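Q: What does the assembled structure look like for these inputs?
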Amino acid sequence: MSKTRVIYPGTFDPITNGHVDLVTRASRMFDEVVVAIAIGHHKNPLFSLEERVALAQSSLGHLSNVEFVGFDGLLVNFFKEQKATAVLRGLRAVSDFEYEFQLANMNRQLDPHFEAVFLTPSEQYSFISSTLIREIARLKGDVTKFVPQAVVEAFERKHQQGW
Amino acid sequence: MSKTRVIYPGTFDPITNGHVDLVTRASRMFDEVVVAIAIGHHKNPLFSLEERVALAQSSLGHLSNVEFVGFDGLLVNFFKEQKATAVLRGLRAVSDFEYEFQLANMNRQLDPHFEAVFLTPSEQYSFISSTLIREIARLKGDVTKFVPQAVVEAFERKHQQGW
Amino acid sequence: GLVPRGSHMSKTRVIYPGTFDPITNGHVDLVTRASRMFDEVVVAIAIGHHKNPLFSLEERVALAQSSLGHLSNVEFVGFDGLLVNFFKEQKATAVLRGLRAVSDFEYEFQLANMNRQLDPHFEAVFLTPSEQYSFISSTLIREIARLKGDVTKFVPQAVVEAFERKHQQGW
Amino acid sequence: MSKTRVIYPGTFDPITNGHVDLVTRASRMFDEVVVAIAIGHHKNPLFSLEERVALAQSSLGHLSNVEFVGFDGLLVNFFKEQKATAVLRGLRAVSDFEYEFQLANMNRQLDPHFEAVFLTPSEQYSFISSTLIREIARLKGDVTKFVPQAVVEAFERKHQQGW
Amino acid sequence: GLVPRGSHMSKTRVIYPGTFDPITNGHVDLVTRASRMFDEVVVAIAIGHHKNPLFSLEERVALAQSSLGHLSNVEFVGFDGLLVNFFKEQKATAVLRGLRAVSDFEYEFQLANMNRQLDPHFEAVFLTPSEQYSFISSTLIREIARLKGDVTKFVPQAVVEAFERKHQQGW
Amino acid sequence: MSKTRVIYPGTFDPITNGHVDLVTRASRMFDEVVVAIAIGHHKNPLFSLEERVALAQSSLGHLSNVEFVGFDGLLVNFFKEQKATAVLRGLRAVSDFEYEFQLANMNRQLDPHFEAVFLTPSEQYSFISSTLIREIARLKGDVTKFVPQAVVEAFERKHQQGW
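A:
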């Protein structure tokens, strides 16, 4: 009836090839995909919101139906303001499944129009998370295989600034 | 190029209020939803394919973008013949998550256009499964709260016959 | 907590259902632990429609009685039909289940919610096994005994003897 | 002649309708229930111990066999000093199940009279956690449906103090 | 106080037990990896007492041999009875099992502890499958083949042919 | 036919009877076992690297084919420099299984000669972790049953300095 708009929220600290694959797949199935970068009040992020947004834009801007927005506040309010059809999340592991199952039910209690749909990662990206990529990079491991080029460069800048 | 058609496969033996809720939710997000009832060769289902199809049609036929079709079970071929955008599955528990994660990866190896999207049930349906409903009904427990009216009647017919 | 503690009606009765085919030291430990916490424990041996049992109901009940009859607040009863009806007819306070693994946790979480939908007075409490019994299950004990492995460390004496009788009868 | 006394330990930061339901259920099965509010060694809790105790008392004081006590130190020592029959914990998710399975075995090694009994939440509270309620309230979402009245008011006081 | 590396008694022998009904590319990858780490690998095909396997023991052994016979330190043997006795008679260093999923992890964790109770020299080592084989099981391959799906991507050539023979005989 | 050299990495903060059992078991199966203590800079450790290495050496030095070495954390580089056959990890619980499954796949992407083999603990050690042992010792619980003697003494040194 209305054209579909899906929100893909996260901290994207930084964006990885796992995120890229999910957004690519989502962009084939929904009219509009909003990459929604939570400022991340607490759980302080390595990269600034601005840096995170720019890395997302550079990594995914080739997809013409994808938008990039920073947000703060509640997911469920952002959902309503965006007039979204659903939220999209990736499920890598059992702990993700459990957490998102709970969140979807809480958010649906907060707004009965809330919806959450899930994808599972492609096998070659199944282990990739931002947290793990940060840990490898922090120990000066090479993360080139797992993240876009701009992210590799951003990590190099971060080391030169003493992280 | 860009209307969406999603397959919701299962044995639906019988359909439950959980299935109804997932199909209803899916019908709001995709242009077309195909309720695909696997004949279930490997299993011996309690209800015949014809009975299962009829129960699905009666429970969901009010949704004008939902179709009902029997099929063999071989999901990836059915996906291709239906020119589907994705397969939809509900994930009730951790064991479902693991099994479907594997199947999605296997199916994607068989057809790189395969896609699988997942929904998690609302908490008032999270405990309902067909298997469990069958066991309760077999021991003449009351399943009225968990299944459509037609399903209650079908169970009554089954008692008057065998079972 | 409004009924006076002297009263029969303040007392707790818990059902511990299972097929007990056969009872193992794991079951004995759970019943012993439960018997310290509840006034009455009912070892409720499901006849086991489906998944046909090695030992008869009568044999299973007798093995349970021999293994646990020293606990004076434990009863032993066969049942068939729905757990939730048995719960109501026994006037139980709760059902007790042991959780050995994640798949148990999962299944029982669901069952408790279904059973509570069927009867709003239903309750389910769970114990986890002590680490010395965590690897024991009846299924596994049967398989070992069938292949004439030694199960003496895992089951009461009477169960060892029952397995010996079973071999003498051509399992 | 022996009464049962069960300890329900937690940080209760704040107490939620989930906790209320578990304590209510436990109070029907044991002679005495002790709501034991751990000071919360690190991972500092939004509400003070005193505030948390008061919220628990107001939420559950209608149950005449329930007591409220702050504690610090090892659970197993608290258990012994309270002459408890068992500790009660709720199991929301697989990660809870695994952690408590381990803790029960460790605590039994520390004191062979230790016992731990578990309840699973009813489906209408399965999605509630304190952590999540805090995050929602912080972003001025409405938590009225998930927590007692006094907790709503306590959150309002916290906002008026700039959180 | 170690046996010298020249000695036969420094050598490792690992048993990889299963029903291999049929062998899959998942099994092949695990045996290949294990063959690089242990001096001898025994592919141990459990007859599958009352499991009613699709392929005969002889067929299963032949398929394993054809799929893995290029690895010169791998042997192929049928067995029946208890794993722990087979372990002892083979003078094995360990049993090897693959862990695909959480349910595998839990089951094998338990079995290793039970088997160690039966024989304190028992050992079990685990590998996780390579990502491209993570979903593959014999059970699943059988279900796909039964519905005449194509299993060529997941099993060795000989297994594809064996399935074709099975269809020509009505399966 | 080459000799086998297996790395057992961790923070060993401190070593426990669980670690001792796994190393003992591994030492029976491989020609060489390297207890590899990650310095662990972030997620800072209670015991110094030097102390951790010495506790490992005292606890396991009776096994003549076991070596003790500090390293940075970057496992896949350490693997290559050590010319290792495999990495060994213990899997205590489902969360360990999932995390290590992912790490093995990441590491294999980084180096196709990477291998990871897993043991599961004996049931008498299944509940022991360093994290938990630290917490118990900190709250003056007795950890004698779970750790080597030297580790008990190390905790006493820590108490004498006011921890």
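Residues 27 and 104 of chain F are 21 Å apart (CA to CA).
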